[PDB]
Design a protein around this ligand. Structure first.
Ligand SMILES: CCCCCCCCCCCCCCCCCC(=O)OC[C@H](COP(=O)([O-])OCC(O)COP(=O)([O-])OC[C@@H](COC(=O)CCCCCCCCCCCCCCCCC)OC(=O)CCCCCCCCCCCCCCCCC)OC(=O)CCCCCCCCCCCCCCCCC
Ligand SMILES: CCCCCCCCCCCCCCCCCC(=O)OC[C@H](COP(=O)(O)OCCN)OC(=O)CCCCCCCCCCCCCCCCC
Ligand SMILES: CCCCCCCCCCCCCCCCCC(=O)OC[C@H](COP(=O)(O)OCCN)OC(=O)CCCCCCCCCCCCCCCCC
Ligand SMILES: CCCCCCCCCCCCCCCCCC(=O)OC[C@H](COP(=O)(O)OCCN)OC(=O)CCCCCCCCCCCCCCCCC
Ligand SMILES: C[C@H](CCC(=O)O)[C@H]1CC[C@H]2[C@@H]3[C@H](O)C[C@@H]4C[C@H](O)CC[C@]4(C)[C@H]3C[C@H](O)[C@]12C
Ligand SMILES: *C(=O)CCCCCCCCCCCCC
Lengths: 171, 70, 547, 88, 120, 459, 81, 17, 127
């Protein structure tokens, strides 16, 4: 899905990046970029949805034979050089529950704060369980979204892992 | 660990050190000094060491090809 | 003898001690990387002392200290051979590794497993000196498969990444396919001769040795990434750049050639193999260099530069010039290590960016790195009286003026031209033109370690070739009489390569759209060999399995 | 990696800095909560080009799906902080 | 080799065979030939341990070279003068090979013309 | 041999009469001591074997298999005590008794001087083996796979009995030493062909040969850790040891009656090594590795050359230590995630650093990294089969290439990648688990320093 | 830290080839909004970058000076025997 | 190394055992 | 359109949590608490002696470390290898086999005082 509105927009970003790879130098890219913009704005006012789709059919087909064989990919993005590079250093937080007490003495203050955070999760869970139950449309939720908290001092449902996920560059 | 003695600059040409540039000149120039001296003192390697003879210019006297009738 | 034999083995035992102190003792953690760097620092100097003795009087040793196993009429000993190839190579490998062990202290400072990384770098070096000094084929295998493992463990250093794990398994798969040739030679010599020792192999000199040499050549095809088994060397750039510099460009990849240089006494007689090694080298030097032009990642380009050169070593083997290929290996190590180390400075300054398209305008921002990136690049192409000149030039002279395959002679020269084109592309895109990297500038190379490491190998890329070429004893009848054009064919094509390259770069400035040429797409996608073969073969073997 | 630290204030400046240099937009109208479709009145297409610019300012791709949901500068700033875990 | 075009593209019998050469007895046109002389004794070359392929007529210079170098250590630029001698001696040796090639080439053409006119 | 049989018997009174809490400490500490005195069996002479009595002898082929057998018992106690902590004491003691009973039959099996005494003790082993695998086996899944025994007994153990009895009436003795000096050539004949199959099919199934291998993967999935350790380490070797002994009296028929079996083993190596790649269960992947490794041993035995026999003996000992080490490593995970699926837990090197090292060493020796005895064995088998026919290097080479793939594919899948998010019970490795691996790989690596002891009687 | 950003008014396409881009964009009738963003790459010290030959000849001036003096020393030192 | 404070607890599995 | 009012809220609620958690990840000035660890006078000696340092003062310290390395990691290993090679490896046949030295014309033999005959006179080429 994504509707003809989004589907066309994505092509714009994807087509631009490939162009940026092909032309290499910024100046040539900028000039050749503006030409690209013109082709997009030309049919931006087409009010025939049936015709609008046909523009996309040929538009993508044109792109398929314009794509740079090696398009530039951001280093830390999927398919990039550094993608998943640091996943070895990311250790999930629950591993700290197994530390030897002698080790935990080395970091007293942090572990003390951890106990506070753990207590928050345990108490909030029962409340968090209810909130999803009542809002849930019988027959299973139809979408993957979640509802924000509806009371003071109540945390949004299912917040532990999003909050405590390992940092981007742990070490 | 000099406390990042180089400081980052935004959208601008970076800060450099004098010592960094000096050494770069010393070696890059040194490359040319070496290359030049080697041409001068040993130009033969690039251009040859001995004269390649021309086979055709030789005489049948040295090649000892007897006369056609002989 | 006393000094030669004793100090030949202190080097090997000196490198192991840092490994031994990891398993026991507790005198110094935290400072392990500098402890290792000093071991190679000292192991080099101790390795020079035997080298000087070899230069002075051509002294050569075999040391078979330990008797390990006697399989009836086959006796296996821990035999080290300190001859022409061992004595020259060890200081070169130690000197190159010395700087890298120092460049890794900077390039890998943040990584918390820094001590583990230095343990693996040293454990490779130990398995490489074993490979070169080995005197019998079985001991050669310990080094042969010892390096193969240490590639797996280092290529997949960042084991979270799924591409790193794929690249590591790919390295193993191609080498072990080549190691089918190694065992075939091992089986043949035991069956037809009676030893895995090299001495007895050369003494008997089998006249009909087509089968064992095919097996030996097949090992070089896989280990040194020749055509048919080459895809792993590009894909093995997934590891940390110090790994790619020390292993997959300076040393480990030469072991495939080093195996054939060991067996020149047999290959010299066998013409039928000489053709194959010549043809095998001829295609690989062209193909990889042809692929090098259209690449966009600095590591990948320099990876194909290694393969294209390695093929030139394989051609040298074919034209029956084994001692030159050895010289090319030693000279090649210096500047190819410097290239990677310099490309390490760019990548580390630009925040882990390997695409040259997003590099530029560094010619003034990084003086020291730029100077070396020029010095190294000039050596590769064939700048007169640089380290690369003393090896590459003669190889072209001996190829031109020898009974050879016509197409192989032609491909070598074409590839030498291409070596000029992508020597510039690194310079033009990475050093010249206006900057193209993200806004925030952090380009800072003012660190003693990165500088000292680069400085040392920079000297090697200048004077190492001149010293090595002069000192080593004469071993063949060099050809110095030839037509002038054949004499300077190397320089002309190098010059003709530059001219075409610079014109191509300028055309990139001109505001004209990009047009896809089939020749261009074939270049960029590596000829589709990686795509077709890493999809058809895995699919068939995995799918056939269930039946 | 030397020290490329990022802080919310610094990120905010850079995002605005890029926004100001976009000719279609005015310097003084721009503010942290300036909805692109309304306060600055820009096409949806132009919204794409703003995103592509921001990727290059910080050199990390913003996924297509999440780019759409960004429609004001204050949205972008907090998105960066999330991905790069900027907390203070 | 421009000459190569002559053999493969051009007529074959005229051009020499790089492998089967020579194809005429030595004196067929060379009355009084002087046998090549080897300065270095077999024992000397064997004692020097010269590589077999280097055990050719130019050895005596090469032997002198290595002797100088071993003495001139640690100086490695000392023995330039000897180096040239052996290198040039090879150059002259190479030339003789070139003469051997042409002598074959001329005779082959001479044979061609003689038999052709007679066959006419 | 009584110096070993008796103290092994005294382990049963030791287990039963110990303090309830000290059964594991006593049995492990005293089963370790028995193994120490088993190094006296290396009193080997060049010309003659070490013959103790009319019943038992010990030559170079049985000495390692005996030392491996008695080294394994203390390991099998350490491996099993963790999952036997729940169950009551009397059931606990019987489990230890069955293991002590198995060792007692195995030490007498490898040293039996007469072939009927070997045969009877060769089948008596299955009694403790099946009780351990079915009574304490983790799987109550109901196989109906007894047909593999009905196939085995009808096609294996029974013909071996009728042939061994037939041979004694003809030769007059089954003493192994006597058969060395009284053996006669086996003339071609349809009656002799049946004698050859009778004397070998019983051992081929246990190896197992390709085509007869399907029982092994199923047995490993059912068995507890102790069952798999003894099964892979030793019981597979009883077939190998049986064929090395009994091929003495089968010549020259082995020259032409071994062609069909070598083609199963040579082609069997590739088929099972490839199947390892597509396996989803660790214990099945390790179980199919055994069939691929034992396929070399079958080829080595049947080509009967001095180099092959040294190769088979090194492989049998080397494979035993390696495969049991892999089975233990697989069990360490199962004792956590509680599943035998390989894909379930991944990236475990992030949570268990040292355990990932043991996995690496176990994989390296399985893929045969020189100079491990895993390669000393494999290389010798490859050298000799090359003489048998140079073409075999093709099949031997491909098997080396595939073997490195599942060896490391197993390493990559379980120890590398992103850890499974929802698995939060990966507690740190115990000293019991680390000591258990170290007792598989420290002896295995030390054997490279003195490899002659494992190279058999052809050395 | 503060990391003061340089005044956004400094960056203007004028005086740079980016300005030339606008001219050719004027002929078609279109205008590039992002030109000012790319200005920093073409100004401020990044503007002057030598060509391929220039870098190759980096340091030659000192190189030749050392060379010419060098041959003099051997010339003179040999002249003194 | 280049900044003060900012020392963040490094989450690692237990190395004691 | 951007984030619905709830989405805007949810991201806001979590965002505050995430930022606090990351804030909690910082270490206190006292941490990490460690046992003191022993210091032998070998440590004490350089701790204060080089506190002022300066080039001439610390060059001794740099040469000290290399000396400790050289004696332990070069001198001692070469005694072991020399004791091993001289009195165990060379005392067995053919353990160390060395290529016989190159004997050139006009050389003197140490063993026999022999003098090799000179070479024949060269053809007196122009050289
Ligand atoms: C063998 C070389 C292994 C080198 C090594 O240490 O790497 C292990 C290393 C384990 O460490 P790691 O995983 O890298 O990272 C550190 C770990 O986290 C944990 O390691 P760590 O550094 O943090 O802790 C110290 C270290 C060690 O901890 C210890 O304390 C070691 C104690 C056990 C050793 C006992 C040996 C002695 C046995 C007893 C009997 C002899 C003594 C009796 C004699 C009495 C006197 C006569 O830990 C370990 O390495 C764990 C494994 C140790 C046992 C391995 C088996 C040996 O893994 C590998 O590197 C695999 C090796 C890859 C192949 C390299 C070799 C290929 C070429 C073959 C060379 C062939 C040479 C021989 C022929 C000539
Ligand atoms: C590898 C190098 C180590 C070799 C070794 O382990 O020593 C064995 C050697 C026995 O001599 P060998 O005749 O070769 O016996 C072979 C039987 N497998 O042992 C020897 O012959 C000499 C052993 C004594 C070495 C004396 C030096 C000891 C140095 C102090 C210990 C550190
Ligand atoms: C096989 C040869 C033995 C044949 C005997 C079969 C019957 C044995 C039997 O079923 O006894 C079961 C008995 C369970 O009784 P339980 O409640 O555990 O009493 C405390 C145990 N100490 O537990 C027992 O079996 C206790 C007796 C164990 C046998 C070893 C006793 C050591 C001293 C005598 C040596 C007997 C050797 C047999
Ligand atoms: C069912 C019966 C199978 C045929 C067995 C048989 O007939 O044996 C014949 C042979 C008799 O010969 P015998 O009297 O001992 O000596 C005088 C020489 N004629 O007997 C013999 O001499 C030797 C008998 C050897 C033991 C026979 C065991 C019976 C099973 C034979 C098949 C084994 C293979 C099973 C299938 C494996 C999978 C292919
Ligand atoms: C031998 C000594 C043990 C006595 C002590 O604790 O001081 C230990 C302590 C720290 C060690 C040193 C460190 O490991 C590193 C030092 C610096 C250089 O790498 C040379 C070796 C170097 C000089 C080492 C030599 C030796 O192993 C040392 C000096
Ligand atoms: C051999 O590899 C080189 C072939 C190149 C063609 C050269 C033709 C031009 C020279 C002709 C006159 C000189 C006589 C050799």
């Amino acid at each position: 899905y994504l509707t003809h509105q989004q589907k066309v927009l994505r092509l714009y970003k994807r087509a631009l990046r490939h162009l940026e790879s092909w032309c290499i130098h910024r100046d040539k890219y900028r000039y050749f970029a503006c030409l690209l913009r013109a082709r997009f704005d030309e049919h931006k006012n087409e009010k025939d949805m049936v015709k609008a789709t046909q523009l996309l059919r040929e538009a993508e087909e044109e792109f398929w034979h314009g794509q740079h064989p090696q398009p530039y990919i951001f280093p830390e993005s999927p398919g990039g050089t550094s993608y998943e590079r640091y996943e070895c250093y990311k250790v999930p937080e629950w591993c700290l529950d197994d530390w030897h007490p002698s080790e935990k003495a080395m970091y007293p203050d942090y572990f003390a704060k951890r106990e506070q955070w753990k207590k928050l999760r345990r108490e909030s869970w029962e409340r968090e369980v209810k909130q999803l139950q009542e809002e849930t449309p019988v027959g299973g939720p139809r979408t993957e979204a979640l509802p924000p908290a509806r009371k003071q001092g109540d945390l949004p449902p299912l917040w532990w892992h999003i909050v405590t996920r390992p940092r981007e560059r742990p070490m | 660990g000099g406390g990042a003695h180089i400081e980052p600059r935004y959208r601008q040409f970076p800060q450099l050190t004098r010592s960094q540039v000096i050494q770069a000149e010393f070696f890059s120039a040194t490359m040319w000094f070496w290359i030049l001296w080697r041409f001068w003192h040993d130009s033969d390697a690039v251009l040859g060491h001995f004269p390649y003879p021309d086979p055709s210019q030789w005489t049948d006297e040295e090649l000892g090809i007897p006369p056609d009738d002989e | 003898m006393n000094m030669f034999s004793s100090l030949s083995l202190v080097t090997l035992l000196l490198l192991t001690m840092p490994i031994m102190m990891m398993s026991f003792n507790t005198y110094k953690p935290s400072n392990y990387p500098l402890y290792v760097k000093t071991a190679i620092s000292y192991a080099f100097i101790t390795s020079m002392i035997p080298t000087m003795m070899f230069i002075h009087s051509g002294q050569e040793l075999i040391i078979s200290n330990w008797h390990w196993l006697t399989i009836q009429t086959l006796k296996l000993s821990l035999s080290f051979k300190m001859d022409y190839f061992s004595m020259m190579f060890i200081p070169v490998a130690l000197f190159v590794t010395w700087s890298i062990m120092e460049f890794s202290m900077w390039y890998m400072y943040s990584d918390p497993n820094i001590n583990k990384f230095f343990k693996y770098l040293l454990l490779f070096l130990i398995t490489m000196l074993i490979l070169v000094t080995a005197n019998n084929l079985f001991q050669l295998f310990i080094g042969w498969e010892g390096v193969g493992i240490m590639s797996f463990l280092l290529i997949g250093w960042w084991y979270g990444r799924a591409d790193a794990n794929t690249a590591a398994l790919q390295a193993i798969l191609y080498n072990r396919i080549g190691d089918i040739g190694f065992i075939l030679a091992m089986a043949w010599f035991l069956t037809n001769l009676n030893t895995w020792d090299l001495q007895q192999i050369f003494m008997l000199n089998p006249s009909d040795s087509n089968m064992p040499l095919i097996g030996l050549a097949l090992a070089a095809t896989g280990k040194s990434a020749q055509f048919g088994l080459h895809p792993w060397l590009p894909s093995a750039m997934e590891g940390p750049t110090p790994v790619s510099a020390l292993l997959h460009s300076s040393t480990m990849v030469v072991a495939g050639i080093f195996l054939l240089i060991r067996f020149y006494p047999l290959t010299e007689n066998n013409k039928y193999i000489q053709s194959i090694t010549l043809c095998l080298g001829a295609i690989t030097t062209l193909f990889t260099a042809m692929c090098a032009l259209t690449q966009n990642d600095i590591k990948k380009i320099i990876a194909f530069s290694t393969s294209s050169q390695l093929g030139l070593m394989m051609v040298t083997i074919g034209i029956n010039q084994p001692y030159l290929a050895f010289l090319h290996i030693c000279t090649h190590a210096f500047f190819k290590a410097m290239l990677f180390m310099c490309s390490g400075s760019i990548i580390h300054s630009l925040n882990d960016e390997q695409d040259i398209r997003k590099m530029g305008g560094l010619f003034k921002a990084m003086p020291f790195t730029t100077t070396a990136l020029i010095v190294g690049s000039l050596a590769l192409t064939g700048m007169p009286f640089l380290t690369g000149f003393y090896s590459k030039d003669l190889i072209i002279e001996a190829a031109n003026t020898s009974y050879t395959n016509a197409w192989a002679l032609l491909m070598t020269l074409i590839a030498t031209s291409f070596t000029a084109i992508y020597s510039t592309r690194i310079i033009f895109f990475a050093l010249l033109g206006q900057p193209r990297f993200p806004t925030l500038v952090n380009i800072n190379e003012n660190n003693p370690l990165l500088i000292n490491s680069i400085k040392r190998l920079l000297i090697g890329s200048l004077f190492a070739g001149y010293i090595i070429s002069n000192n080593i004893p004469p071993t063949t009848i060099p050809q110095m009489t030839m037509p002038y054009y054949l004499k300077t064919t190397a320089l002309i094509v190098t010059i003709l390569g530059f001219i075409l390259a610079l014109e191509i770069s300028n055309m990139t400035k001109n505001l004209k759209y990009h047009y896809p040429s089939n020749a261009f797409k074939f270049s960029t996608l590596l000829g589709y060999f990686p795509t077709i073969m890493h999809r058809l073969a895995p699919y068939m073997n995995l799918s056939m399995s269930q039946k | 990696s030397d020290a490329p630290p990022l802080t919310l204030e610094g990120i905010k400046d850079r995002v605005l800095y890029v926004l100001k240099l976009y000719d279609k937009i005015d310097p003084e109208k721009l503010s942290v909560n300036s909805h692109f479709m309304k306060d600055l009145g820009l096409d949806s297409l132009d919204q794409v080009e703003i995103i592509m610019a921001m990727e290059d300012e910080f050199g990390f791709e913003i996924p297509d799906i999440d780019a759409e949901k960004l429609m004001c500068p204050q949205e972008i700033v907090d998105y960066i902080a999330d991905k790069k875990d900027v907390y203070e | 080799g421009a000459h190569l075009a002559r053999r493969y593209l051009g007529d074959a019998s005229v051009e020499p065979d790089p492998l089967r050469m020579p194809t005429f007895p030595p004196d067929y046109g060379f009355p009084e030939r002087k046998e090549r002389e080897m300065v270095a004794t077999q024992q000397e070359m064997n004692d020097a341990q010269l590589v077999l392929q280097q055990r050719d007529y130019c050895a005596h210079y090469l032997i002198r070279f290595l002797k100088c170098k071993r003495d001139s250590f640690p100086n490695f630029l000392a023995c330039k003068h000897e180096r040239h001698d052996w290198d040039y001696c090879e150059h002259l040796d190479y030339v003789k090979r070139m003469k051997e090639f042409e002598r074959e080439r001329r005779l082959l053409q001479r044979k061609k013309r003689r038999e052709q006119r007679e066959a006419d | 041999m009584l110096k070993y049989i008796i103290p092994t018997i005294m382990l049963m009174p030791l287990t039963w009469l110990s303090k309830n809490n000290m059964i594991w400490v006593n049995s492990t500490a005293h089963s370790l001591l028995i193994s120490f005195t088993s190094l006296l069996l290396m009193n080997q002479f060049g010309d003659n074997s070490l013959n103790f009595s009319l019943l038992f002898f010990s030559d170079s082929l049985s000495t390692p298999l005996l030392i491996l057998t008695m080294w394994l018992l203390p390991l099998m106690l350490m491996a099993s005590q963790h999952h036997l902590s729940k169950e009551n004491l009397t059931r606990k003691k019987l489990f230890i008794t069955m293991l002590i009973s198995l060792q007692l039959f195995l030490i007498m099996t490898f040293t039996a001087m007469e072939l009927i005494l070997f045969y009877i003790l060769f089948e008596a082993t299955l009694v403790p083996t099946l009780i351990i695998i079915t009574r304490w086996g983790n799987q109550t899944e109901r196989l109906n796979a007894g047909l593999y025994f009905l196939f085995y007994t009808l096609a294996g153990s029974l013909p071996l009995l009728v042939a061994l009895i037939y041979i004694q009436n003809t030769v007059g003795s089954l003493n192994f030493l006597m058969l060395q000096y009284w053996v006669q050539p086996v003339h071609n004949s349809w009656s002799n062909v049946f004698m050859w199959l009778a004397c070998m099919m019983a051992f081929m199934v246990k190896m197992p040969l390709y085509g007869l291998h399907l029982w092994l993967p199923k047995a490993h999935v059912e068995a507890p850790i102790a069952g798999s350790m003894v099964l892979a380490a030793v019981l597979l070797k009883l077939g190998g040891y049986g064929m090395l002994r009994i091929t003495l009296i089968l010549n020259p028929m082995t020259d032409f009656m071994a062609y069909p079996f070598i083609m199963l083993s040579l082609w069997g190596m590739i088929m099972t090594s490839s199947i390892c790649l597509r396996q989803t269960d660790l214990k099945s992947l390790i179980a199919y590795s055994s069939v691929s490794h034992m396929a070399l041993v079958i080829v080595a035995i049947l080509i009967q050359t001095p180099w092959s026999y040294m190769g088979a003996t090194a492989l049998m000992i080397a494979h035993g230590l390696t495969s049991s080490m892999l089975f233990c490593l697989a069990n360490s995970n199962y004792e956590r995630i509680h599943s035998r699926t390989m894909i379930l837990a991944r990236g475990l090197q992030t949570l268990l650093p040292l355990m990932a090292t043991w996995w690496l060493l176990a994989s390296l020796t399985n893929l045969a990294l020189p100079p491990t005895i895993n390669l000393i064995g494999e290389l010798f088998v490859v050298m000799s089969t090359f003489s048998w026919s140079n073409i075999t290097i093709i099949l031997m080479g491909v098997n080396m290439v595939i073997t490195a793939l599942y060896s490391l594919y197993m390493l990559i899948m379980t120890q590398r990648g992103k850890y499974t998010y929802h698995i939060n019970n990966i507690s740190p490795s115990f000293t019991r688990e680390n000591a258990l691996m170290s007792l598989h790989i420290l002896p295995l690596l030390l054997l490279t320093l003195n490899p002659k002891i494992i190279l058999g009687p052809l050395y | 830290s503060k990391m003061e950003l340089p005044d956004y008014k400094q960056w203007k396409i004028e005086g740079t080839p980016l300005e030339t881009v606008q001219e050719k964009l004027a002929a078609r009738g279109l205008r590039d909004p992002w030109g000012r963003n790319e200005a920093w790459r073409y100004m401020g010290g990044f503007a002057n970058n030598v060509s391929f030959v220039g870098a190759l000849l980096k340091g030659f001036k000192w190189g030749f000076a050392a060379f010419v003096v060098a041959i003099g020393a051997e010339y003179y030192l040999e002249s003194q025997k | 190394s280049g900044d003060h404070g900012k020392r963040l607890f490094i989450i690692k599995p237990s190395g004691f055992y | 359109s951007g984030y619905t009012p709830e989405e805007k809220l949810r991201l806001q609620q979590l965002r505050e949590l995430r930022r606090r958690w990351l804030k909690d990840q910082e270490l206190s000035p006292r941490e990490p608490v460690l046992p003191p660890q022993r210091v032998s006078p070998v440590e004490r000696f350089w701790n204060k002696f080089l506190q002022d340092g300066a080039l001439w003062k610390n060059v001794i310290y740099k040469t000290y470390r290399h000396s400790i390395f050289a004696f332990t990691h070069v001198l001692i290993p070469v005694w072991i290898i020399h004791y091993y090679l001289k009195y165990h490896v060379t005392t067995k046949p053919y353990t160390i086999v060395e290529k016989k030295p190159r004997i050139f014309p006009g050389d003197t033999i140490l063993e026999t005082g022999e003098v090799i005959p000179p070479m024949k006179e060269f053809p007196d080429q122009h050289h």
